Amino acid sequence: VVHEDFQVTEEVKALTAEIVKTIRDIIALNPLYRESVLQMMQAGQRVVDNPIYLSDMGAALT
Amino acid sequence: HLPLIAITRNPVFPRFIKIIEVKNKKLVELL
Amino acid sequence: GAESHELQDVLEETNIPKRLYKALSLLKKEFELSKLQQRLGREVEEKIKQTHRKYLLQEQLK
Helix, strand or coil: CCCCCCCCCCCHHHHHHHHHHHHHHHHHHCCCCCCHHHHHCCHHHCCCCCHHHHHHHHHHHC | CCCCCCCCCCCCCCCCCCCCCCCCCHHHHHC | CCCHHHHHHHHHCCCHHHHHHHHHHHHHHHHHHHHHHHHHHHHHHHHHHCCCCHHHHHHHHC
């Protein structure tokens, strides 16, 4: 399970932000699943200890 | 003289309306 | 979209010009990061679009 990441964990999450925004837009314009999962899992809550899993879930929604 | 509010990752920018939601019920008694 | 640490650093500054300059620098850095992400996304998006439009025609045929 390769999870190489840069030591600068400051600007990387910026892309994450974009991703989540995109995801939000999609679910707003193309409602596929409930938004309750979005409320439970929020990037601002610091509970996403595995951002790779969040990205994989987002790509799954596609 | 009140206990520090559990921010729980709820930033409050100056002069910005924000909503705080902490799962802990202990803050309910204080409120 | 600056991190809470950046906001605290701005609040640390006392002189009005100093805090204003720090805020402007943070704005510039956030704009640079957002522009980098947007350009990079656009490049990836065109790379998708590099797929010959026959993919759109196939999608319409289906």
